[PDB]
Amino acid sequence: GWYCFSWPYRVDMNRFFQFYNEMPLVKTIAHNYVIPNGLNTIVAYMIYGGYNQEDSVIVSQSFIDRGGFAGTFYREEKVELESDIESFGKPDPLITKNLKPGANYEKLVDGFVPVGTVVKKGDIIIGKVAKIKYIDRSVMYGFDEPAVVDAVMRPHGPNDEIFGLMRLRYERNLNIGDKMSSRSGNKGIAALALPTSDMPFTEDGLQPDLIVNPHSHPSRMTNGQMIETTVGLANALQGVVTDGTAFLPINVQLLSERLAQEGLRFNGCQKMFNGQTGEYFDAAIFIGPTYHQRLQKFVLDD
Amino acid sequence: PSIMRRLPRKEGRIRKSLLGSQVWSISRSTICGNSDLHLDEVG
Amino acid sequence: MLIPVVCFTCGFPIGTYAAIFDKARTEYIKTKMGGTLPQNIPLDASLQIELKDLITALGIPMRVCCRTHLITTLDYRKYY
Amino acid sequence: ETNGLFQMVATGAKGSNPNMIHIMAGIGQIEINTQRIQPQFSFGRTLVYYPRFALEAQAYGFICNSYIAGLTSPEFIFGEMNGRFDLINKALSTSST
Amino acid sequence: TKVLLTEILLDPMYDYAATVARIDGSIPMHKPRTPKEAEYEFKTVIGRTPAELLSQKEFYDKIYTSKYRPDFTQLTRLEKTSTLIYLRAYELFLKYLQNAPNFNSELAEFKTYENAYGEQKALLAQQGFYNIFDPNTGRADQRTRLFEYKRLPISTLYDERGLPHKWTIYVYKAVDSSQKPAEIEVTRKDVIKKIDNHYALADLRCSVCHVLQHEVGQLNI
Amino acid sequence: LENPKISTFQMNVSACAWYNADFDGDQMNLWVPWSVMSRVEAELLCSVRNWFISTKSSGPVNGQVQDSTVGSFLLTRTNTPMGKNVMNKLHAMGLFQTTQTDPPCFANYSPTDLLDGKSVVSMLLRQTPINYQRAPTWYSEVYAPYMHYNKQDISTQIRNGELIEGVLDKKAVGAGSSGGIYHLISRRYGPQQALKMIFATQQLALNYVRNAGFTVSTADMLLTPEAHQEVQEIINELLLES
Amino acid sequence: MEKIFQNVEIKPFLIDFSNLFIKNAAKKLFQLEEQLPLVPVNVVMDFKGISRAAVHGLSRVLQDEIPNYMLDIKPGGYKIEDSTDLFMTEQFIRNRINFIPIYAKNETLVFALRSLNNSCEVKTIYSRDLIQVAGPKLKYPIFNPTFEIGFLQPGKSLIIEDIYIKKGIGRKHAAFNLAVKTHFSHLDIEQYPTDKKEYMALSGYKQSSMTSDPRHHRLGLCFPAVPLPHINQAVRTYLKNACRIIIGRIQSIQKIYENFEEPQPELVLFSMDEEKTKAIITIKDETHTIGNLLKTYIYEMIPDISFVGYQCVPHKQEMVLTIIHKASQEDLITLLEKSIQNIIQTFQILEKNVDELIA
Numbered sequence A: 001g002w003y004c005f006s007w008p009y010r011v012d013m014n015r016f017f018q019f020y021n022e023m024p025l026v027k028t029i030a031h032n033y034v035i036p037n038g039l040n041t042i043v044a045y046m047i048y049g050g051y052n053q054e055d056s057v058i059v060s061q062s063f064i065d066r067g068g069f070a071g072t073f074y075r076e077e078k079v080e081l082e083s084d085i086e087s088f089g090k091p092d093p094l095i096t097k098n099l100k101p102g103a104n105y106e107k108l109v110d111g112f113v114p115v116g117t118v119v120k121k122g123d124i125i126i127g128k129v130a131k132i133k134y135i136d137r138s139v140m141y142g143f144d145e146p147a148v149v150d151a152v153m154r155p156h157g158p159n160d161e162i163f164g165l166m167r168l169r170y171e172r173n174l175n176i177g178d179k180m181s182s183r184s185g186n187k188g189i190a191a192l193a194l195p196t197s198d199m200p201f202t203e204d205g206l207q208p209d210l211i212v213n214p215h216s217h218p219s220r221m222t223n224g225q226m227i228e229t230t231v232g233l234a235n236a237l238q239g240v241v242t243d244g245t246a247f248l249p250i251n252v253q254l255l256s257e258r259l260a261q262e263g264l265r266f267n268g269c270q271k272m273f274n275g276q277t278g279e280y281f282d283a284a285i286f287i288g289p290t291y292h293q294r295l296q297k298f299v300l301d302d
Numbered sequence B: 001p002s003i004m005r006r007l008p009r010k011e012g013r014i015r016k017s018l019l020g021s022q023v024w025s026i027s028r029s030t031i032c033g034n035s036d037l038h039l040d041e042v043g
Numbered sequence C: 001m002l003i004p005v006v007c008f009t010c011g012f013p014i015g016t017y018a019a020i021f022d023k024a025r026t027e028y029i030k031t032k033m034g035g036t037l038p039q040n041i042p043l044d045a046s047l048q049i050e051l052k053d054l055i056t057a058l059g060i061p062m063r064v065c066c067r068t069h070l071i072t073t074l075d076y077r078k079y080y
Numbered sequence D: 001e002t003n004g005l006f007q008m009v010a011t012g013a014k015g016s017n018p019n020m021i022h023i024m025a026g027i028g029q030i031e032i033n034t035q036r037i038q039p040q041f042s043f044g045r046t047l048v049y050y051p052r053f054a055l056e057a058q059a060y061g062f063i064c065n066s067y068i069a070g071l072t073s074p075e076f077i078f079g080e081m082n083g084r085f086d087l088i089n090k091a092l093s094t095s096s097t
Numbered sequence E: 001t002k003v004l005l006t007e008i009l010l011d012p013m014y015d016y017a018a019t020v021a022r023i024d025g026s027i028p029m030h031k032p033r034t035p036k037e038a039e040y041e042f043k044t045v046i047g048r049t050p051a052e053l054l055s056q057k058e059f060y061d062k063i064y065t066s067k068y069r070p071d072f073t074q075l076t077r078l079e080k081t082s083t084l085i086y087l088r089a090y091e092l093f094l095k096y097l098q099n100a101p102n103f104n105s106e107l108a109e110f111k112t113y114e115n116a117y118g119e120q121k122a123l124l125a126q127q128g129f130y131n132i133f134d135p136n137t138g139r140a141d142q143r144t145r146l147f148e149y150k151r152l153p154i155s156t157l158y159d160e161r162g163l164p165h166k167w168t169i170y171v172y173k174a175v176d177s178s179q180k181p182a183e184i185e186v187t188r189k190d191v192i193k194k195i196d197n198h199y200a201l202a203d204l205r206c207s208v209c210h211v212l213q214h215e216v217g218q219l220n221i
Numbered sequence F: 001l002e003n004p005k006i007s008t009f010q011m012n013v014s015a016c017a018w019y020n021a022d023f024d025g026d027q028m029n030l031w032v033p034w035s036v037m038s039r040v041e042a043e044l045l046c047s048v049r050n051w052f053i054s055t056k057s058s059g060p061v062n063g064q065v066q067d068s069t070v071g072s073f074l075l076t077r078t079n080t081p082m083g084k085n086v087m088n089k090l091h092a093m094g095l096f097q098t099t100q101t102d103p104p105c106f107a108n109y110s111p112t113d114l115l116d117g118k119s120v121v122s123m124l125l126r127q128t129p130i131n132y133q134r135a136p137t138w139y140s141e142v143y144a145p146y147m148h149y150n151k152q153d154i155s156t157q158i159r160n161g162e163l164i165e166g167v168l169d170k171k172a173v174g175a176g177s178s179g180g181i182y183h184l185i186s187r188r189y190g191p192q193q194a195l196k197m198i199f200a201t202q203q204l205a206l207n208y209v210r211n212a213g214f215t216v217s218t219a220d221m222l223l224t225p226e227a228h229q230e231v232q233e234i235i236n237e238l239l240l241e242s
Numbered sequence G: 001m002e003k004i005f006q007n008v009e010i011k012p013f014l015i016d017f018s019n020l021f022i023k024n025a026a027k028k029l030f031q032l033e034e035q036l037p038l039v040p041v042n043v044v045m046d047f048k049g050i051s052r053a054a055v056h057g058l059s060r061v062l063q064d065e066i067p068n069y070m071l072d073i074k075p076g077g078y079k080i081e082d083s084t085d086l087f088m089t090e091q092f093i094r095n096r097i098n099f100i101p102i103y104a105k106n107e108t109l110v111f112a113l114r115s116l117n118n119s120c121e122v123k124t125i126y127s128r129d130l131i132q133v134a135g136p137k138l139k140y141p142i143f144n145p146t147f148e149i150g151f152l153q154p155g156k157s158l159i160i161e162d163i164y165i166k167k168g169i170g171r172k173h174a175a176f177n178l179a180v181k182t183h184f185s186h187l188d189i190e191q192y193p194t195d196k197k198e199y200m201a202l203s204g205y206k207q208s209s210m211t212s213d214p215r216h217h218r219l220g221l222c223f224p225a226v227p228l229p230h231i232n233q234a235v236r237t238y239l240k241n242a243c244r245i246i247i248g249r250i251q252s253i254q255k256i257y258e259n260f261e262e263p264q265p266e267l268v269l270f271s272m273d274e275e276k277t278k279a280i281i282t283i284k285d286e287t288h289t290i291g292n293l294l295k296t297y298i299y300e301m302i303p304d305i306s307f308v309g310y311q312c313v314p315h316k317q318e319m320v321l322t323i324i325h326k327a328s329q330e331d332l333i334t335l336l337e338k339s340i341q342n343i344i345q346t347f348q349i350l351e352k353n354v355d356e357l358i359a
């Protein structure tokens, strides 16, 4: 989510700023005091090809492309010097000893890679030479996913000595292997991403952002997730945001009759079609908005 | 530091270095479901 | 940080009516809030604020996804 | 013929009969180590919500509500007492094994 | 000069004063791209060049001061109402750094002003709220499907001879009247062997006192 | 996986039983033998067909899990809420278009001919003909008083690969089911032949559901107003005894 | 003369200025009293005497398999030195700009975005601030001016150059998607009243999809940005384009089928018996559209075929069509050519009816 409101002024390590956040359609009293983190993803509770079994989930590729759970991931690189022994600068091969083999030193400008360039594995991001003629104490970018240099400064440490501070950013969309969760504790790994025309759709054109297995419910008994979809389905059509705080009086029978008041079915299920074949399922499918949240466990980092 | 302090525990010589090993040519990743793969296949 | 340009789910151009929809909301809410302080509006327990007819008058269809993302999206300008 | 919750349980795909009963009918007595809720809140009281030497079954972990109906505050506390044991024993099922 | 510029360029005060200077055009809207641009921006923001700064011992006395001096006495509730808050906040920040007289009272006055302003901004940030009302009442719905304790008659557990009920006999009634026989009474073992889809489970029967469950209220309590 | 945007190790859900794994965020190690001696040992000793039968319990480890379990029930179920559980020639051919086995012969079928789910299953079990006769998990004496069982669903019989009657569920096709379909195929045709049939029957079940549909809703967990009063009466009788 | 589809309904989505809140907000935001230059258009089409493979393939192509245009930023367009705003990052603004629905005539138009905030209040950047810097001067707008591109803190800037029109299909990136689904139904299958509690778990149709074979369909799709005075011209064009796309892809397979004597990696022929022939057609980067069309029409041509299937595997990026039939190789290839010709004729008739219906 918005992990901090002053993020551009900070140089943090392993911090993710998710661009888009939504208030839940069924919110709680906790959202009066903290900013909500997540999105009101449309979720279909159905079997679709077997790619959603055992905590697996099927994501819409179009939902990913539009920025769903997308954000920027940050890393820092702090490099200190020795007093008058070490210095920042581009090493030269003629007089410097033990340069890194097969390393790129050509992106450096005055010892630091300039802000705005893409650094890949095997690039030197900070040039650092110690004088004895010189020993190459440089720092190489050892990550398999490329970054972009976001901010470079040379602040003064506690001992009034210069050190190098680098901020690297990563454009992180949702991708296969990333972890999402509902507010009822049902966490899943994105297993398959389908295009728009391959996702299932209802008679009215509604398609899900996520397809979760119905088998995640019966043993886990996360009934607040199913009630949230039922309530939020009528919230969206009515144009309202309600409160779903714990221990508030609810009646699932009356919340289900609220669906039929808005033109839907009692169970919230709709006639659905297979996006690949164009054929309708014989069973109506429970599809509706369920607030989902992306857990900061990235497959690119693991 | 002592010579015999290197031996005893789970982080010691015998259990960390002799009964186990850091190895090369190995990969790790998050696992995911795929119904088009056979049971004896890994994607 | 803003209402999305298109609906996250189906891609309908939600954003072209976002700005208008935002400001109309405030006026509508100013009609119904009463004496309750603004930050206690989600606590009033007597408010019934329905935006259905406003979004319909914008021309946006009756799609669950589009109205969900229009209604629920947080605006970074209002918190920073 | 049509209920997906029943078909997942009846065929053996997922869930059990007590899972359906808990969701739909009632949770019943919370048992920890084959016992009811022990009076741990000051000598004869199980919680601040029940008097001392209370006789009703609700005071000792009998949850009358189902998950669909929702639990009251004392029923959620007794449910959290039972559910905390599952988390503790799962952590112990790794180290002790 | 270079070490002092690197020291001061990392000061948040410098960024705030540079922003205030950019707003009213005292410095270019882009970050300096040349040493001359950096020197000019430093001279404008800090009020003196790096060489004349360390020469001496004052630093905060001549930091930029916004050009437009709006009237902040309309911040007494009485473009505007947001320009005033910003400019008065920067001016009060500069007064704080200079330990100006009567700062502590003006700070509380501006705190009240900006608390009212934040009340407005919290009004702008509201997305709506709805309460499902019970039609019978006119306020938030209190109808629930929670368990309600009720002392049942003792005949629901015991018969007129003091014995408990055993609801182990299942009574099935034919759905269609032409079906013969009209009723069948079977136990759990023989349900699959004697009952088909032509029958519906009507009631349970006690295997001790032989009473239908719905006819248990006919027992003398 | 040629897609450059995939960083995960992917495997079939029926292979998870070997590792006690699931897809909530588990990480697994993988190394490829480069030595000739280790490559020979990998494929002759350590292949996962060698651990289809448990060393601990002497029973099968793999089977259908959660989607080909309920999917096999739906496919082999006698009656659908819309009449007999049959499908035309085009949709029967579509169940085999993913199994990656040799397609059966549908030449003796008009486009309007109707095939039931046990005929389609038998078209796959003819390759490994086994014999099986047990009551399915579907039939429970607990449910019998309050629901009408179809007499053709509660007696699962397979004769030389022909599903004569009954439904396929956890008892016949589930993972860990001793004496089940894949345990019997292993005992007569080898554990590698059993693994091939677990995949093939999984694709039949998943291709059936992709036209039949399967969902869970909030209304699946909601009692009727009359049933809620009956539950309250039962709990009041418990508290009366207390 | 086969009238495959008739009864087209075209209806734009318009702003209701009768509502006073909307009217006042639009007036004192954008000085807006008329409709926007580009409006979404809902198009509902009735097809008769056609399989749902063809209609659903048309729908899929109109959704995310038709060439479309978006706005993108050329590398180096985002000016880091000039954009002093710390919150409007290039990823955010690029994602916003990619998804503005455009109705462009050529790929030559180049735009720029030069926003300065000389005020003490946060300033919002809209689409009306996108100035055209290259290409012939626009006589009609290609996007609406009411999109919130971003916002600048007091004293900040945002300079973006080299904003250009990019072409692609929505199957690769969703910013090239064209149509959103608004309706799909079969008019020749009866339906239950599903508001009743004994039918609400079922889809509603009185025939199972495992047995039904509908030939009469209603399909409704919404196009997101169409000029108001030329709506009928745009929709018609879109429909015709979709048909051509399908025809082209089908014709690609016709190039394989007429080279079956020449060894070809995309076509493998087996003689399983002395009388049974097997054909396997593997096409890279093909989808369920063409696979389902091919399977359906081969099945129509050979009703007593031994097998036909069209497996499209997600992790293989391949469509593999398997055909097993009791003819020889030459007879099988002749039948397959007949099936492909039937597909081509169907979509040519669709083009003709699109021209006939929309004036």
Ligand SMILES: [Mg+2]
Residues within 6 Å of the ligand: F022, F023, F024, F025, F026
């Ligand atoms: Mg796990």
Ligand SMILES: [Zn+2]
Residues within 6 Å of the ligand: C007, C008, C009, C010, C011, C012, C063, C064, C065, C066, C067
């Ligand atoms: Zn939408």
Ligand SMILES: [Zn+2]
Residues within 6 Å of the ligand: E158, E159, E163, E164, E165, E166, E206, E207, E208, E209, E210, E211
């Ligand atoms: Zn009795």
